[PDB]
């Protein structure tokens, strides 16, 4: 169905807090973090890590991976009902979970670590991946159907030393699952020409900077490269993953990414964790090998820090930024919808926006002006005739005894008045 395509300052966006169920807790002094949200085919996947104390550095208490239905509550407004919850024995070992819906199940692929975040301790992390398959509609007195845990032995990684899921959600093509992922490649093996680093209109940029900034720091062992992890269900036996590296068009440090189907075709978002701060988003040209037709988008960036702030395009050695994805809602006019932090060098001020490449059509703040915020994950879908979007937004520093993200439901307007 149609949507509003005119640039207007009218209050036609009316964000509401969505009703969603989870295992209800009464523990104080807790931070809910490392969120994941996937919405596909009338079902959803959700995850978090509960920490006691600090969000960044508290003692890990509970990890949950959960799935359920996204339903019409009665008055043509979406709700969410959890149906199946999985919990590991040790909360601190599960990292970088990514989820993909196929049939009956949400197949979630996580990394396993005893050295913390593999990104921050790459050389130490011995590569271990595993898959939690949860059924979106549990059946009593079945076997493996409801919950099944699989340790991945067979991993096909090309020329990369290590590979890992790196993103919230992926897609299905037939019976082949594609998770967003990243490859770890030694700097010395990294094939790259310094002449291709666009420093030509940048007085204080060096040719070396693009290459140097392909790692988490300038003297890091590995470089990171985004990609897909492929999992073909048609071979119904031993589980075998194949890594696919992203094309080098507009290349940037491997960063959390998302692949999703919208209006029949696949679309890619990659976070801008470096100097190329403008939003990276576009239709998938080919999936294997992965190649994106990045939009020449000129109005959506992300907050940085001193070295690589918002709207930066000059190559610099920096690892900073925040994942703030967007969802294509109209391909003919290429309009998307997502939440961006309206701030240059601090993670603040979340704003839900609907935008073309060179224009924000209409928007609305979700919190105040001085409200702290990090990750934002948006997924959009039809509920009968009407396009709806669900957005999980990390909101911190609030003073709550329990810091947890807030989930918004937004109706996209058809008319441009009112």
What is the C-alpha to C-alpha distance for residues 98 and 337, in angstroms, rounded to an integer? 21
CB of 373 to ligand NAG, least distance (A): 16
Question: From the CB of 214, what's the least distance to ligand NAG, in Å?
Answer: 21
Task: Determine if 139 is a binding residue for a copy of itself (CB under 8 A).
Answer: no
Cis previous bond, 397, omega within 30? no
Binding window for a copy of itself (CB under 8 A); candidates: 279-287, 337-345, 346-354, 397-405: 397-405
Q: Which of 5, 22, 287, 386 binds a copy of itself (CB under 8 A)?
A: 22
Q: Which does 313 bind (CB under 5 to 8 A by kind): ligand NAG, a copy of itself, none?
A: none
408 binds a copy of itself (CB under 8 A): no
According to the binding rule CB under 8 A, does residue 383 interact with a copy of itself?
Answer: no
Instruction: Decide: residue 299, CB within 10 A, 0-12 exposed, 13-18 middle, 19+ buried.
Output: middle
Least distance CB 46 / ligand NAG (angstroms): 27
Residue 79 near which of ligand NAG, a copy of itself, none (CB within 5-8 Å, type-dependent) = a copy of itself
The least CB distance from residue 415 to ligand NAG, in Å, is 28
Q: What residue 90 binds from ligand NAG, a copy of itself, none (CB within 5 to 8 A, per partner kind)?
A: none
Between CA 29 and CA 112 the distance in angstroms is 27
Tokens at 129, concatenated: 């991946």
C-beta separation of 67 from 44 below 8 A: yes
Interface with a copy of itself includes 234 (CB under 8 A)? no
Binding region for ligand NAG (CB under 6 A): 115-116, 120-121, 124, 176, 232, 234-235, 293, 295-296, 310-311, 344
Q: Please list, in sequence order, all residues whose beta carbon lies within 8 angstroms of the beta carbon of residue 319, skipping any fewer than 6 positions away.
A: 213, 215, 216, 217, 253, 273, 274
Closest CA to 186 of 217, 162, 210, 158: 162
- Given 2, 6, 10, 21, the residue binding a copy of itself (CB under 8 A): 21
Q: Name the residue among 88, 90, 89 with its Cα closest to residue 47.
A: 88
Give min distance, CB of 287 to ligand NAG, in A: 9
Taking CB under 8 A as the binding criterion, the range among 181-189, 234-242, 363-371, 394-402 that sits at the site for a copy of itself is 394-402
* Residues near 104 by beta carbon (within 8 Å), at least 6 away in sequence: 135, 136, 137, 145
CA distance 228 to 257: 9
Q: Which does 234 bind (CB under 5 to 8 A by kind): a copy of itself, ligand NAG, none?
A: ligand NAG
Query: Which of 37, 281 has the CB closer to ligand NAG?
Result: 281
Part in contact with a copy of itself (CB under 8 A); list of ranges 82-90, 170-178, 195-203, 311-319: 82-90
Task: State how far the Cα of 258 lies from the Cα of 179, in Å rounded to an integer.
Answer: 8
- In angstroms, the CA 340 to CA 365 distance is 10
Alpha-carbon gap, residue 305 to 316, rounded angstroms: 12
What is the Cα–Cα distance from 393 to 215, expressed in whole angstroms?
27
Nearest to ligand NAG of 37, 229 (CB atom): 229
Stretch of residues binding a copy of itself (CB under 8 A), selected from 96-104, 189-197, 368-376, 398-406: 398-406
CA–CA dist 114, 283 (Å, integer): 37
Is residue 71 part of the contact set for a copy of itself (CB under 8 A)? yes
176 binds a copy of itself (CB under 8 A): no
Q: Which stretch binds a copy of itself (CB under 8 A): 139-147, 169-177, 221-229, 287-295?
A: 139-147
Cβ neighbours of 130 (radius 10 Å): 17
Q: Is 402 in the site for a copy of itself (CB under 8 A)?
A: yes
Tokens of 185: 């490649």
**Residue ranges binding a copy of itself (CB under 8 A):** 17, 19-24, 26, 28, 71-74, 79, 81-83, 85-86, 138, 140, 146-147, 400-402, 404, 406
């Amino acid at each position: 169905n149609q949507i509003c395509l005119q640039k207007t300052t009218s209050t036609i966006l009316k964000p509401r807090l969505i009703s969603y169920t989870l295992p209800i807790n009464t523990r104080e002094g807790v931070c809910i973090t490392d969120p994941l949200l996937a919405v596909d085919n009338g079902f959803f996947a959700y995850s978090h890590l509960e920490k006691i104390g600090s969000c960044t550095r508290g003692i890990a208490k509970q990890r949950i991976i959960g799935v359920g239905e996204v339903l019409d509550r009665g008055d043509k407004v979406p709700s969410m009902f959890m149906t199946n919850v999985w919990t590991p024995p040790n909360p601190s070992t599960i990292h970088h979970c990514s989820s993909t819906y196929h049939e009956d199940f949400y197949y979630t692929l996580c990394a396993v670590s005893h050295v913390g975040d593999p990104i921050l301790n790459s050389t130490s992390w011995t590569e271990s991946l595993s898959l939690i398959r949860l059924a979106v509609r549990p059946k009593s007195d079945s076997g493996d159907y409801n919950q099944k845990y699989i340790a991945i032995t067979k991993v096909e990684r090309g020329k990369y030393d290590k590979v890992m899921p790196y993103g919230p959600s992926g897609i299905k093509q037939g019976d082949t699952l594609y998770f967003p992922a990243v490859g770890f490649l030694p700097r010395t093996e990294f094939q790259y020409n310094d002449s291709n680093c666009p420093i030509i209109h940048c007085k204080y940029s060096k040719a070396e900077n693009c290459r140097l900034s392909m790692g988490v720091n300038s003297k890091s062992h590995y470089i990171l490269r985004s990609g897909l992890l492929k999992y073909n269900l048609s071979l119904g036996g031993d589980i075998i993953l194949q890594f696919i590296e992203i094309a080098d068009n507009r290349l940037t440090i491997g960063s959390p990414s998302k692949i999703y189907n919208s209006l029949g075709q696949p679309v890619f978002y990659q976070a801008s964790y470096s100097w190329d701060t403008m939003i990276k988003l576009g239709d998938v040209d080919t999936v294997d090998p992965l190649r994106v037709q990045w939009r020449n988008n000129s109005v959506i960036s992300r907050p940085g820090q001193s070295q690589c702030p918002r709207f930066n395009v000059c190559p610099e050695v920096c690892w900073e930024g925040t994942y703030n994805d967007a969802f294509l809602i109209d391909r003919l006019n290429w309009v998307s919808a997502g939440v961006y932090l309206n701030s240059n060098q601090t993670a603040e001020n979340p704003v839900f926006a609907v935008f073309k490449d060179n224009e924000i059509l209409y928007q609305v703040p979700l919190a105040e002006d001085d409200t702290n915020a990090q990750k934002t994950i948006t997924d959009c879908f039809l509920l009968e005739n009407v396009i709806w979007c669900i957005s999980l937004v990390e909101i911190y520093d609030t003073g709550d005894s329990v810091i947890r993200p807030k989930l918004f439901a937004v109706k996209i307007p058809a008319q441009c008045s009112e």
